[PDB]
Structure formats: C-alpha cells, structure tokens
Amino acid sequence: SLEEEWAQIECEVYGRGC
Amino acid sequence: QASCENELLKFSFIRTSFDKILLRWEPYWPPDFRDLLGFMLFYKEAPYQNVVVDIDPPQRSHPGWLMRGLKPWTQYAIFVKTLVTFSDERRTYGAKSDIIYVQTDATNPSVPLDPISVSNSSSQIILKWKPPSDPNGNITHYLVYWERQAEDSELFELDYCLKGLKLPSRKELEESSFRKTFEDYLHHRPFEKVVNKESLVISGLRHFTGYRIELQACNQDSPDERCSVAAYVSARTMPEAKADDIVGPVTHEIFENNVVHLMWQEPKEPNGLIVLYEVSYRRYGDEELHLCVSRKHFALERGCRLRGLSPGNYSVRVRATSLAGNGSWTEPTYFYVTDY
Amino acid sequence: HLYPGEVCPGMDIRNNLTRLHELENCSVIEGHLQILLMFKTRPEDFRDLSFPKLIMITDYLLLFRVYGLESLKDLFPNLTVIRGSRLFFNYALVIFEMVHLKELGLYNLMNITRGSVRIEKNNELCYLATIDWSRILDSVEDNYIVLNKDDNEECGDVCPCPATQFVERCWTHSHCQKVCPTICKSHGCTAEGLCCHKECLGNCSEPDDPTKCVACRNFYLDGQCVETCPPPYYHFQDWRCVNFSFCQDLHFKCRCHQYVIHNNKCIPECPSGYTMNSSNLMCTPCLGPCPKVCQILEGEKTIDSVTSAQELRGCTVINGSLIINIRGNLAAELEANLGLIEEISGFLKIRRSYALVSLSFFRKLHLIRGETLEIGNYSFYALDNQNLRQLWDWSKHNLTITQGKLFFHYNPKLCLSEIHKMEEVSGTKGRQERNDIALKTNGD
C-alpha cells in the first residue's frame, strides 16, 4: 500500500522513527 | 528576496491512490550543501490544464512526499521548488520543477438521493431519483432491484367485524448539522441496469401489492463491479377496480328446519386479501338487515348460516371487502323459506 | 444489588459484532451507546444475541443503518432509564435509516429523564402510534417521528392492556406498555399497582423499599438509592457516589478529563475563577488570572486562522510548540485568543504569515523554554514573513529564551536592529553561529 511505501521511504531518506 | 530559480527539477516516480498521492523527484544539492533549507511543494485543485508544504532536506537518495487529504477523481497541479540561502558569494539560485498534473483514483460513489416511487397504473411503478452528490467518478449506470413483500401474516387470522374494525386504508442549523453528520458517517432478485437515465418504469407487477425497491449507483461495469450503498424505497401499485367483484350467483340451500346455507364463490384474485364478507338481506317491506362473515367464519361454515326468521321472500346481496376498499354489490337473489 | 454487573463506558460499534460482546457483564453504561454501519450482518446473527443485564444508559442510544436487526426486544429487554446527561443534538434516542427494523421492542423503557426522540426513515417500522410518549418523556413537543412505515398506513399493530381518541398502548405484538397509576407520578409501580419508594424510578421488585429499586432517581450507593450522598462520598457523573480514592485514581490515570473535587462533586475540570490544588484535589479561588496549562498533541500546533486559535483561548502556559501560518479584525481578535500566554515550553515559529504586521498579540509572553526544538536546535523560527515589521516593543516588553537558537530568513521589513535587540534581550548572543540570522535578506 501507499502508506507502507511512504513509511519505508521515510526510513530510507529522512530516517524519522524506524 | 524573490524566487529566481534557474535550474530544473524532474519527477521520477508518481503513484496515486483514491485519496493519497506519493511523489519523488531527482535529488538536488547546491555547490555548498549547507545552503539547502529544504523543499517547498505547491499543489492545488486544477480542473483545467490552463494553469504549500515544507519538506525537510534529505540526509547526506530520491526524496519524496505524500499528500493525504485529497478528494477522489480530481486533478491536481503539483510542482516542487527548492529553498536556498542567500550566501556571501554569487547566490546559488536553486531549481524548481515544471507544473505536472496528477489525477487521483476513484472509489465507491455516494448513495443516490431523493428516490420517489409513484404507482400511476395498476401494474407499473414510476421511479425517479437524482444523481448522487458525490459521484467519485463517472457514474456508468444505476442498479435497481425490486422485491415483492408478502402480506402480514397477522392479518390472515383476524376477525374484523368484532370491535376494533379500523382497517388501515392501504434552529435549522441543528437539523442541518445532524444530517451532515449522518451523511458524513458514510465515509436472485429481479433487477435492471438503468444507463444514462434518472427514471425507470416498472412493468409486469401484481395488482395492489407491496414492493420494496433497492437503488444503487455504479461507475464500473465489467472489471469487477464496485459501487455504492443502497437507498431503499417502498411502493404499492394501484388496485384494479373490478378485481374484488364476486362472480357467480349466490347459491342457497334450505334445510327442513328452516336452516339456510349460503354458498358464494370466493374472489380468487382479490386486492391483497378479503377481510370480511357482508351479507345484506331485507324482505318485502322490512328494514335492511346486515351480517358480517370473517375469514375463519367463511372457512368453517363454507358460506353462511341463517335460521329463525319470519315467513316471507328475502333478497340476498353479498359484498366482499378488501384492503383497497369495498367491492361491488352482488345482484340480488330471491329465495322463499318453507313455512310449513 | 440494584446493579449486579459492572459499569461499562460508552462505546461506538461499527461493521462488526465482536465489540458488542463487551457489554456481556456490565449492568449500566456510563456513556453513550452507538450502533451503526453494519452491512454484512444477517438476522441469523442477531438471534442468539441478548443483553438482559443492561438497565440504564446515561447519555443516549443511537442506531443507524444496521442490516438484519428486526427488533430490539431481544437486544435490550431490560433497558429502563435513559438519563440523557449529554444528548445527541438534543436527542436521547435516535433511530435513523434503520432498515429491516419492524418493531421497537423496548418494552421495559419507562423514563427518558432529559432529551427527545428522533425515529426516522425506517420503511418497515411498525408499532409507533401505539406508544404513549407522554408517559415516558416529560415534554413531547420536541419529538421528530416522520417518514417511516407508520405514516404511510401499512401497519397492522395488534396487541392484547390499558389504553389511553382512546387507543390501545403497546410496544410489540405480545408486549403492552406498562402504565402506572397517576399517583405513582414518576416512582413507578409494581405489577399489583402499589407505588414504589420515593427514590425508585420506573420499576421496583418490592414496593415501598429503597434497596429494592431498579434505577435510582437521584443517586446510587452500595445498592441503595439515596437523595444525596453522605460524606465522605462525592457525587459523580450526576448519578452515583464515589469516595475520594476513586476520583483521585481517575485523576492520576491521566498521567482525558483529570477530575477535581469542588462543592462535593468530582467534576472533569474546575470552573472559571478556580484552580486545582495539587495537595488534595480541591478547586480553590485564584488571585488575578487563573493559570490554565494547556497541552497539545505531538508538541506542535498550527494556527491557520482565528478559528484554529479559538481553542487556545484563556491559556497561559503551553507545554508544547506554536506554529503560526496565518495568511489572512485580525491582530485584534488574535490578541483576545492568544494575549494571555506567559510561557511556551517548546519553540515558537512564524512561517509564511503574510497578514501579520507585528507580534504584539503575544502581549504576556515572557519565557520560551525551548525543551523541544526544530531540527538544528531552533527555539525562535521566522521564515518568509512579507509584512513582519516589529517583534516586540523592547522598551516596554521583556523576554527570555532558555534553550535553542534564532533563525530569521526572508523577512524583508525587519530591521537588523530589532533582531540584534532581541538577541541582546533574550541573552542568546553567544549561541547563534554563521548563517543562523540571515544578513542581507532582512530589512529591505
């Protein structure tokens, strides 16, 4: 889904949370 | 002080949903990487192609963003402009991107509103409705199901001429907010597909019967049909005027003890059901005398019983009463009792 | 006795039956009950579902678009009182667009203490004209019962019971409305016709006895209806009596309606002109402005206009951060909403606020803690303010920033003298580094 992809990309490039 | 971006940004990944959009663009870094204060993403609802969110800088590949509050089946104009710092040297003006257009997907449409059913004839129901206020796509066709509702089982075993014979003749802001809240809460029967119409005539129906009609709107037909919740309406066809008439003359039989048995053909196809039979007789010069027969009475006695009357010639008329109304009076039949 | 089960909190149930089983044990719902948006259910699912222990609903009951439910006579056969503490748009019982509903079935309902009834758009609902709403509600002029099956005459409402044009009164086909003698004004009567105690309400198993009621009229304590809770008990939810420990525990569990004690009442918040004492949880009068600490979600809040700032009215200390992004009676009503704040725990940011001419609306602001900071350790943020001309009149105003740095960028109408004066006053002179206060894009 879009939300999980966004969470993964936020893990990758912005690093927030994760 | 002003926006004089000279270089160019390019989008490399766009993925939509029914109410979200995820974008990516190529990474950007000025010669001094500290000058980047982040990105700015502009998006607006642009129905025609004749045309702010702040994003933190990425760590030191492809950055991205995700919009969540977008309406379905709408077109959005989106472009991303960088935000740089006016340094002590020849300013790095940064880059912005062209205006792109992204359309969100579709979802289940809203419920069709204002359904009105009117029975003009005795077998046709004219159904009208207005398109839903939230189509969420191109409404391909409406789906109408209709189901025949049987008569109440309680009315089939009730004696009606007994006492109790009343037959059924078969601050605006607060209210606006109430209805707004309740509409916002919403995020093989014989049928018909209405295409490019807002009204449908139902033909081939039983006379004077109750019909429950379920109405839906749909925006996708062949690939795994997906569409709205149902709107429910009820209707009742008008009755045939002569359908309650009792056919055949009223047969009479007389026993040896001045006992009279009355037979009359049942109204095979009445308007719903027959609640009672009224038998009115009056001899030559007497006052009219009426008698009630309930369904159980008629079933038990196969007609009606008469006994203990003065000698003379009586005329009998029988009328059947149904849900629609009183039937036609039977032609009088004359009989003469034995007076010994 | 008088409430053998537990006390559930109010709940909303949607799309499934799993949560509905949480009411299996509790006797009185201390909240509102909503049942709505259940599409895949069928009458084969509601056959074995019954809650005979539900006796009392405090605020209201809402039913909306439930498929497969034909009668409530199997769900709530012992619901007696709906108090109506907080209503639903001034409605204590709402049944809207409730398809497949044939008869009401609330044959044990006796009193709706406050509110009205809204039954609407049920194209199969019968048994509505055979209900004497004058015996249940005090004022029936506010009912709204239209557009159902009863109006378009199609219902053969037949019932065996006293009547009241005189017409029979009944709830279902085999249940008739219980009407007490007029001497039993609201205390209810037993089957034989004897009035219950003065504190009963609706029904009683034994007439003339306080502990044999069904629902108390005033308050409930240890299975005994009471006019007023004797000390050391305090009234609670306007319907029961609880000791000090219970209210204190409810207050502590918020560490949300942190409850306080005032005038022998455990109320959600102290009224105006009072502040909670941290020693014994009693609302005491305050001198001058009563401090009102306000908490915000995630330590951040965006004020886009006056409406978003309306919630901040009366606050003095904020345990979070403020982000002002107002693009358009301004600078005057904003002073009404925010002109009381005296401390901000996090950071203050003004970003792309085109309308603001000056920050004077923060009249009382004297301290910014800066415990939580924007990326880069910034406590005061100012970005692209096209019309910001004056921060604070430093000849009369005072301020202090405990932690964090400053960040001024793209403020065309902000003289560097003002920024340097702010640096002097706040004491953060030795904190800023290069490229922290923009030099040649301010004050033009």
Numbering used by the authors:
A (entry chain C): 1 to 18
B (entry chain B): 465 to 515, 531 to 539, 549 to 658, 696 to 712, 758 to 910
C (entry chain A): 1 to 160, 169 to 172, 177 to 267, 274 to 346, 349 to 464
From the paper:
Insulin binds and activates a receptor tyrosine kinase, the insulin receptor (IR), at the cell surface. The activated IR triggers signaling cascades to control many facets of physiology. A previously reported selective IR agonist without sequence homology to insulin, S597, activates IR and mimics insulin’s action on glycemic control. To elucidate the mechanism of IR activation by S597, we determine cryo-EM structures of the mouse IR/S597 complex.
In order to explore how the S597-component-2 engages the IR, we synthesized the N-terminal 20 residues of S597 comprising only component-2 and the linker (S597-N20) and determined the cryo-EM structure of full-length mouse IR/S597-component-2 complex at overall 3.6 Å resolution. The resolution for one-half of the IR/S597-component-2 complex was further improved to 3.5 Å resolution after symmetry expansion and focused refinement. Structural comparison between S597-component-2 bound IR and apo-IR revealed no major structural differences, suggesting that the S597-component-2 alone cannot induce the conformational change of IR required for signaling. Additional strong densities were identified at the side-surface of the FnIII-1 domain of each IR protomer that could be unambiguously assigned to the S597-component-2. Fourteen residues that constitute the S597-component-2 could be built into a cryo-EM map based on clear side-chain densities. The model shows that S597-component-2, assuming a short α-helical conformation, packs tightly against the side-surface of the FnIII-1 domain of IR mainly through hydrophobic interactions. Particularly, Leu2, Trp6, Ile9, and Tyr14 of S597-component-2 positioned along one side of the helix make strong interactions with several hydrophobic residues in the FnIII-1 domain of IR, including Leu486, Pro537, Pro549, Gly550, and Leu552. In addition, Glu5 of S597-component-2 and Arg16 of the linker region form salt bridges with Arg479 and Asp535 of the IR FnIII-1 domain, respectively, further contributing to the strong IR/S597-component-2 interaction. Our structure shows that the S597-component-2 binds to a similar surface on the FnIII-1 domain of IR as that used for the site-2 insulin binding. Some key residues that are critical for IR/S597-component-2 interaction, including Tyr477, Arg479, Lys484, Arg488, Trp551, and Arg554, are not conserved in the IGF1R, partially explaining the specificity of S597 on IR activation.
